[PDB]
């Protein structure tokens, strides 16, 4: 439908609303936000799916988190994200979980664990987490999904993957072989050419190789992860306040270019919320009291 005045402004705010969860990754957001602006401006290709992305990049910089920030934007929760964990598909015959069993075999009545997720919700963000860890012909079953926009069920129902936003988060340690100035994206792009079959790469709308999370983005990532433990997990009449030296200490400990934001998340459960969980069980600081976090050293 033609958009509400609120929904028009939100969808032009779509970059800056997806940046409330995604710190950095600016061209990753404004590649997946333009795909939703195409669908809602009435410029969706009625044969092709709404978006088809390979979110390639380093492990932990927000590949799955952008697919969850997209699913929260379009639905209100990231539990509406259809996440097909492609590490489960290790051989050729688990492709019968995408579209179900053929006739004459058990599991024919249940008809697929991806097709039936989209018959109910045809407007969906369909996440294929760790698509590199699938077999070489799991994703060959998605070569009509990404141009013709439909996947024929084992029971015999073409299901519309046209109004879906398909996301293939591929996962692509320090420096590579040989002499090179500086120190990358073309290494990730051409590894997709060697791993993925270039029938599959032509059907992807945008291949987005993600950035290293910079130190100026880890400082902003500290504020996001402290906002997890406070307010959702400190609804004990407890308030968590961090001094600006304390968030600087977490950023200096959680910052390694090659991983990003999971060493920060392991730092917070090593400096902050395991020392804090010892203070709650001992009731050094307990329910009904504001916690401040001074810098330790």
């Amino acid at each position: 439908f033609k958009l509400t005045e609120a929904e028009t402004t939100r969808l032009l705010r779509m970059e800056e609303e997806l940046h409330k969860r995604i710190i950095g990754q600016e061209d990753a957001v404004k590649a997946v936000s333009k795909a939703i602006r195409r669908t809602r401006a009435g410029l969706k290709d009625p044969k092709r799916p709404s978006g088809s992305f390979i979110f390639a990049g380093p492990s932990g910089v927000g590949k799955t988190e952008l697919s969850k920030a997209l699913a929260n934007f379009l639905f209100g929760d990231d539990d509406a994200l259809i996440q097909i964990d492609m590490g489960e598909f290790h051989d050729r015959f688990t492709a019968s979980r995408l579209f179900g069993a053929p006739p004459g075999y058990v599991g024919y009545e249940e008809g697929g664990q991806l097709t039936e997720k989209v018959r109910r919700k045809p407007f969906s963000v369909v996440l294929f987490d760790a698509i590199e860890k699938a077999h070489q012909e799991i994703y060959n079953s998605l070569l009509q999904v990404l141009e013709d926009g439909r996947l024929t069920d084992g029971q015999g129902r073409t299901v519309d993957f046209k109004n879906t936003v398909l996301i293939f988060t591929s996962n692509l340690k320090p420096v590579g072989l040989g002499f090179s100035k500086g120190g990358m994206k073309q290494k990730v792009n051409d590894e997709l050419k060697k791993h993925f079959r270039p029938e599959f790469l032509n059907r992807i709308d945008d291949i987005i190789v993600f950035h290293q999370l910079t130190r100026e983005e880890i400082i902003r990532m500290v504020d996001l992860m402290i906002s997890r433990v406070a307010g959702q997990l400190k609804s004990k009449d407890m308030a968590l306040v961090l001094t600006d030296a304390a968030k600087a200490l977490l950023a200096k400990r959680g910052f390694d270019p090659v991983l990003g934001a999971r060493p920060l998340r392991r730092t917070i459960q090593r400096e902050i919320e395991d020392q804090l969980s010892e203070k709650i069980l001992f009731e050094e600081v307990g329910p009904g009291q504001v916690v401040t976090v001074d810098v330790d050293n």
């Binding site: 051989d91 004459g104 075999y105 058990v106 599991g107 024919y108």
Partner: peptide
Amino acid sequence: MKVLILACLVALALARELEELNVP
């Protein structure tokens, strides 16, 4: 080694209930 087992489920051989023809 990687020879797949092919479950091959039969169609349901099930009972039948009856409409009956009324007589005196």
